[PDB]
Write a protein that binds this ligand. Structure first.
Ligand SMILES: [Mg+2]
Length: 339
């Protein structure tokens, strides 16, 4: 932790201009669900019922505005689907925030995993146990509404992915950068939002295509790309609260890279994984005859891409990570690791 102090020292008050990450994924457009505004109104009415601190809810609604993120993740869904999808993102940010006490983390993950089993398992019960904490209580109806619009095929995936997320977060309690990177792969809750594209677009991907090596690769690359652009876009926010386990800082620590080189290395990894992913599209088992099947493969991988581009584009349109003033007229971001 002299280790800590030296990272803090080597990056304090550094200012780093970041190129528009969207440009690094040039073939993948960002779009906006056209009913975001009417959904936020309903999301606003709904949040009044959520047993979370009004001031915590508003900070998330104002600076996070996760309905806008859902609208970028699922820009082509119908508005009726937007409600549950948005509700889901408020849950995962409230829950993730409520964690960031070993005893209390263990207890909360156990209750959350139980909620997931109770809602998405084979003997469903959508009634929260009495005394449930607010971030667990709210999840019960949200998983129920999502389950109502998924096939059991997609349901089963969302169940595992959520469990994986929860258990991942329970298991986070200076790491080698590659160690940090890989556990974020088998943790971060991007893959639940790939599966929720099935809910949004009212289709199911057959397991046999999902297990195909190109499809798995595409999911892994878009998960990796989401993590990588998030490592850069969140460096300011986490450095200021001395969350020093950020891939950039960890490249600084392990390899004695400058922060500039470190960010630059992350930007190259992005470019690498973006081309790996594009190449995987050629190896997908596209059908010669089945249009609907091929329309299902297309929407699925569009959800994968939109998760990387959407995470970036949303971050460029909300204040969760930096103040939007920090963007120049080229969507370039001046990080300011001042404190
Ligand atoms: Mg982050």
């Amino acid at each position: 932790s002299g280790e800590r102090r030296e990272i803090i020292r080597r990056a304090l008050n550094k200012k780093i201009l970041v190129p528009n990450i969207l440009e690094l994924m040039p073939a993948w457009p960002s779009e906006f669900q056209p009913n975001i505004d009417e959904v936020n109104v309903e999301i606003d009415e709904w949040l009044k019922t959520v047993n979370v601190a009004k001031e915590k809810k508003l900070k998330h609604r104002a600076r996070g505005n996760y309905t806008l993120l859902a609208g970028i993740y699922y820009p082509h869904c119908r508005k009726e689907k937007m409600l549950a999808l948005s509700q889901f993102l408020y849950w995962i940010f409230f829950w993730d925030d409520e964690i960031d006490d070993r005893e209390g983390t263990i207890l909360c993950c156990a209750e959350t995993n139980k909620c997931i089993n109770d809602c998405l398992g084979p003997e469903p019960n959508y009634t929260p146990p009495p005394g449930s904490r607010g971030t667990v209580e709210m999840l019960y109806p949200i998983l129920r509404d999502l389950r109502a619009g998924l096939s059991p095929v997609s349901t089963m995936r969302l169940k595992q992915e959520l469990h994986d997320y929860v258990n991942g977060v329970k298991n986070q309690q200076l790491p080698n950068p590659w160690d940090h990177f890989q556990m974020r792969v088998d943790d971060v809750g991007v893959i639940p939002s790939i599966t929720q594209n099935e809910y949004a677009m009212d289709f199911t991907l057959p397991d046999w295509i999902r297990r195909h090596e190109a499809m798995e690769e595409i999911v892994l690359q878009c998960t990796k790309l989401t993590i990588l652009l998030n490592e850069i876009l969140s460096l300011q926010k986490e450095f200021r609260v001395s969350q020093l386990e950020n891939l950039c800082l960890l490249f600084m620590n392990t390899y004695d890279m400058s922060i500039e080189q470190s960010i630059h290395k992350v930007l190259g990894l992005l470019k690498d994984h973006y081309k790996i992913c594009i190449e995987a599209e050629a190896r997908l088992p596209w059908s010669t005859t089945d249009e609907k099947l091929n329309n299902n493969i297309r929407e699925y991988i569009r959800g994968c891409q939109r998760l990387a581009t959407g995470t970036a584009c949303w971050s460029y349109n909300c204040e969760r990570y930096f103040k939007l003033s920090q963007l120049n007229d080229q969507q370039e971001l001046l990080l300011d690791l001042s404190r």
